[PDB]
């Protein structure tokens, strides 16, 4: 139970970021938003409905 | 007479061994620590809840 409590503490430290949902990070050459790849290069293009 | 002395020695051995092996006092520490941990849990878990 205490382990679950500490896990809830870490989950709170992550809960401080709760404002970030749609938030975009950088993956590969491009930057993806909330797990959605945007932009297409000459090598591997992405889907239209994905964009 | 040796049997009577053996009786007294048997009672003595039994009582001494019983008192020395487990006095039940050692469990009080784990009980206190467990109670404190129970308070800390009942506090922190509900707070995080």
From Swiss-Prot, chain A:
Signal sequence annotation: none
Protein location: Endosome membrane; Vacuole membrane; Preautophagosomal structure membrane
Tree of life domain: Eukaryota
Remaining remarks: Present with 2490 molecules/cell in log phase SD medium.
Function: Required for cytoplasm to vacuole transport (Cvt), autophagy, nucleophagy, and mitophagy, as a part of the autophagy-specific VPS34 PI3-kinase complex I. This complex is essential to recruit the ATG8-phosphatidylinositol conjugate and the ATG12-ATG5 conjugate to the pre-autophagosomal structure. Also involved in endosome-to-Golgi retrograde transport as part of the VPS34 PI3-kinase complex II.
Subunit field text: Component of the autophagy-specific VPS34 PI3-kinase complex I composed of VPS15, VPS30, VPS34, ATG14 and ATG38; and of the VPS34 PI3-kinase complex II composed of VPS15, VPS30, VPS34 and VPS38.
Family in the record: Belongs to the beclin family.
Entry text on domains: The C-terminal domain called the BARA domain is dispensable for the construction of both VPS34 PI3-kinase complexes, but is specifically required for autophagy through the targeting of complex I to the pre-autophagosomal structure.
Protein name: Vacuolar protein sorting-associated protein 30
Organism annotation: Saccharomyces cerevisiae (strain ATCC 204508 / S288c)
Organism placement in taxonomy: Eukaryota, Fungi, Dikarya, Ascomycota, Saccharomycotina
GN (gene name): VPS30
Range within the parent protein: 306 to 356 of 557
UniProtKB/Swiss-Prot annotation, chain B:
Species assigned in the record: Saccharomyces cerevisiae (strain ATCC 204508 / S288c) (Baker's yeast)
Mutant lacking the gene: phenotype: Abnormal reticulophagy.
Gene, per the UniProt record: VPS38
Compartments, record wording: Golgi apparatus, trans-Golgi network membrane; Endosome membrane
Family from the record: Belongs to the VPS38 family.
Top-level division of the source organism's lineage: Eukaryota
Subunit annotation: Component of the VPS34 PI3-kinase complex II composed of VPS15, VPS30, VPS34 and VPS38.
Function (record text): Involved in endosome-to-Golgi retrograde transport as part of the VPS34 PI3-kinase complex II. This complex is required for the endosome-to-Golgi retrieval of PEP1 and KEX2, and the recruitment of VPS5 and VPS7, two components of the retromer complex, to endosomal membranes (probably through generating a specific pool of phosphatidylinositol 3-phosphate allowing the recruitment of the retromer complex proteins to the endosome). Mediates the interaction between VPS30 and the VPS34-VPS15 core complex, leading to the recruitment of VPS30 to the membrane.
Protein name stated in the entry: Vacuolar protein sorting-associated protein 38
Miscellaneous comment text of the record: Present with 1070 molecules/cell in log phase SD medium.
